[PDB]
Amino acid sequence: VKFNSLNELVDYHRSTSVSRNQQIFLRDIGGHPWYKGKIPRAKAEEMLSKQRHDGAFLIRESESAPGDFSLSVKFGNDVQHFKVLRDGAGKYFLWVGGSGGSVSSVPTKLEVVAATPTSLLISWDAWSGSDWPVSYYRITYGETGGNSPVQEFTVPGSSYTATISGLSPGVDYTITVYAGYDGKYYYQSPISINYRT
């Protein structure tokens, strides 16, 4: 889902978990009750650690991403942070959707749509992701359980296929695609296959 304002995001997540890993519902901490301006990440952590309830939260203007926002939330003896993302039209969101393929994967699909004995074309075309802008895709591949570092290359965010060449027959390769949001971060979670040409 997407939100027209930070408040819309907040109120939605008072009733629907902000986390994919635990059930975390936002509640006000015990000034504005939840927007704390350019509060440093470390100070936010200290403040939230002194709250009684899991889900105690604030939103802050990020220092590392100027002009953008972060959501900080108490859960047990930890504080979790969520980067507030923007789409092409300024709407805010935290998590990418897609009603097909593998749940919680971005892109949601990764198929080998064509292959020769030494090459292949991977495709994530069937991902329903026009609402989720990608900066660039990063593709990595290498011998499964290999010694060497993986090979990597990138393609523009408009792409929905990628060529991998020079593969040796009978060798298992692990292929992973990361969908960039900007020039630093990818959307969770990447999609990955193992394939033997």
Partner 1 sequence: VYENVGLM
Residues that bind partner 1 (CB under 8 A): 19-21, 70, 80-83, 85, 94-95, 138, 178, 180-181, 183-190
Report how far apart, in Å, the C-alpha atoms of 73 and of each of 27, 69, 123 are.
9, 13, 36
Least Å from the CB of residue 70 to partner 1: 7
Cα separation, 197 vs 176, whole angstroms: 16
Cα separation, 162 vs 36, whole angstroms: 43
By the rule CB under 5 A, 82 interacts with Mg ion: no
Task: Say if strands 191-196 and 78-83 run parallel, antiparallel, or are unpaired.
Answer: unpaired
Least Å from the CB of residue 118 to partner 1: 28
Cα separation, 165 vs 149, whole angstroms: 17
CB-nearer residue toward partner 1: 184 or 196: 184
Encoded one letter per residue, x for contact with Mg ion by CB under 5 A and - for no contact, window 21-40 reads: x-------------------
The site partner of 27 among Mg ion, partner 1, none (C-beta below 5 to 8 Å per kind) is: none
CB-nearer residue toward partner 1: 13 or 109: 13
User: Residue 197 has which token pair?
Assistant: 């040409």
Least Å from the CB of residue 6 to partner 1: 15
Contact 39, 21 (CB under 8 A): no
By the rule CB under 5 A, 105 interacts with Mg ion: no
Contact 55, 24 (CB under 8 A): yes
- Interface residues toward Mg ion, by CB under 5 A: 21
